[PDB]
Amino acid sequence: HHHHHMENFVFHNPTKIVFGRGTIPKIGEEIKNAGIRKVLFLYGGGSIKKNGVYDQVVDSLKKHGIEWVEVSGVKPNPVLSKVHEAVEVAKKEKVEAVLGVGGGSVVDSAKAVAAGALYEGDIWDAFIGKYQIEKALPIFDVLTISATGTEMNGNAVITNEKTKEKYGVSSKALYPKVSIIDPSVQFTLPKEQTVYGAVDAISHILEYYFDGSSPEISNEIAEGTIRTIMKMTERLIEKPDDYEARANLAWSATIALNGTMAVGRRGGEWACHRIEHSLSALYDIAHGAGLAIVFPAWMKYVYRKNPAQFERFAKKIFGFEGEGEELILKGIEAFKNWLKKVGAPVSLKDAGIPEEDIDKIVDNVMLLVEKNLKPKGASLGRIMVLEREDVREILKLAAK
């Protein structure tokens, strides 16, 4: 048998990363050197003004002769109305690029605005298979929360509040030109956000790790990165201004979804993520919080379809020795327990979502499959494609 095949792949990631303390003043230099004179400066709720990130950025833009217009108020699960608002500004002000300053919600919004600025229609079309994004304005970002790896990929997730649809799109045109990551600006993050961001980065790795593939080099890199994220999370809970922890976690989040973990694999599973979108769409919970609930339940539901990799998970992430269903369940339980330790919800009840809502959540998941996945030939899950009834059982596993 041949369960460790390294799949054919194409790898291409042109994004420039500028990383470390004191790097944010380079943002104006990067934009100037990229030949850009006028940007839309997009941001969230003004944590960036409060922590001095805004003044570092503005001082750099002013120093390097960059003109800008601001749009603020991007929300943590970003919404389409705000993208619409910003697209109108970008078009009316003739901006040459979009500069997102904030967390994943801002950088995803920046991508969606960069695409929409070059599209005649409603950019929501791209999230429901009615428009393939081939071109976008250049995107620059100053990242202030490490979680999603959006700073170094072509993905964006937006919620249409009108329809309660939280959907993703992926395009080469949405890779940032330059992303600046100063991990020290993360010292002020709430503990819960730090942890949710770690859970997200781990989950991105696991979506690939569990896709049925098992190349040796990819397993090694995945495992090393998971172990690093876990260690750093624990440090950050105790000491939120531990720079090396922030820095290690930041880069691990970046590589989790920059193409690194995809190499040699089968494209990833993505069932947990797509299920979680419906929780965030319906309840506005943190992405990472939803994943802490769904992932362990999914793992318990599916492991017989990929047992050797669940055994390797137990051995390589947690150091257990053994074989079979016992070892598999030991590893899944340790994962659930670690999530609980660091304070993440591991049930719907932990998050205040009642059991009697399950069927409503399942309806939302199924709509996502029809409207977001089917148009691009995607399906829910890979090692096991999940039908309505499978989604219901997983949520019932995660209910209490």
Ligand X SMILES: NC(=O)c1ccc[n+]([C@@H]2O[C@H](COP(=O)([O-])OP(=O)(O)OC[C@H]3O[C@@H](n4cnc5c(N)ncnc54)[C@H](OP(=O)(O)O)[C@@H]3O)[C@@H](O)[C@H]2O)c1
Which residues contribute to the site for ligand X (CB under 6 A)?
Answer: 44-48, 51, 76-78, 102-106, 108, 144-145, 147-150, 153, 155-157, 185-186, 188-189, 193, 197, 200, 257, 287
| Structure token pair of residue 90 | 């970008």
Write the DSSP string, 254-309: HHHTSSTTTTTS-S---HHHHHHHHHHHHH---HHHHHHHHHHHHHHHHGGGSHHH
Residue 51's binding partner among Fe ion, a second copy, ligand X, none (Cβ under 5 to 8 angstroms by kind) is: ligand X
4 is in an annotated binding site: no
| Distance between first and last Cα of the chain | 40
Which residue lies nearer to ligand X by CB, 112 or 328? 112
Instruction: For residue 23, state whether it binds a second copy (rule: CB under 8 A).
Output: yes
Q: How far is the CB of 70 from a second copy (least distance, A)?
A: 27
H or E element in which residue 322 lies: none
Q: Are strands 139-143 and 165-170 parallel, antiparallel or unpaired?
A: unpaired
Q: How far is the CB of 46 from ligand X (least distance, A)?
A: 5
Q: Which of positions 222-241 make contact with a second copy (CB under 8 A)?
A: 223-225, 227-228, 231-232
Query: Considering only 12-20, 43-51, 113-121, 345-353, which stretch makes contact with a second copy by CB under 8 A?
Result: 12-20
| # residues near a second copy by CB under 8 A | 40
Which residue lies nearer to a second copy by CB, 55 or 220? 220
Phi and psi dihedrals of 45, rounded to 5? Answer: -95, 30
Q: How far is Cα 255 from Cα 277, in angstroms, rounded to an integer?
A: 22
Q: How far is Cα 42 from Cα 107, in angstroms, rounded to an integer?
A: 8
Which residue lies nearer to a second copy by CB, 9 or 374? 9
Q: Which residues contact 274 (CB under 8 A, 6 or more apart)?
A: 365, 368, 369, 373, 380
166 is in an annotated binding site: yes
Asked if 120 contacts 87 with a C-beta cutoff of 8 angstroms, the reply is: no
Instruction: For residue 200, state whether it binds Fe ion (rule: CB under 5 A).
Output: yes
Which residue lies nearer to a second copy by CB, 11 or 323? 11
Each residue 148-187 as x (binds Fe ion by CB under 5 A) or -, in order, gives ----------------------------------------
Which residue lies nearer to Fe ion by CB, 108 or 200? 200
- List b or e across 315-344, with b for residues whose CB sees 16 or more CB atoms inside 10 angstroms: bbbbebeeeeeebbebbbebbbebbeebeb
Write the DSSP string, 153-201: SSEEEEEETTTTEEEEEE-GGGS-SEEEE-GGGGGGS-HHHHHHHHHHH
- For residue 322, the Cα-to-chain-centroid distance in whole angstroms is 33
What are the binding residues?
Answer: 45, 47, 104-105, 108, 144, 153, 155, 166, 185, 188, 200, 204, 273, 287
What are the binding residues for NADP(+)?
Answer: 45, 47, 104-105, 108, 144, 153, 155, 166, 185, 188
Residues in contact with a second copy by the rule CB under 8 A: 2, 4-23, 215-217, 220-221, 223-225, 227-228, 231-232, 244, 247-248, 251-252, 263-264
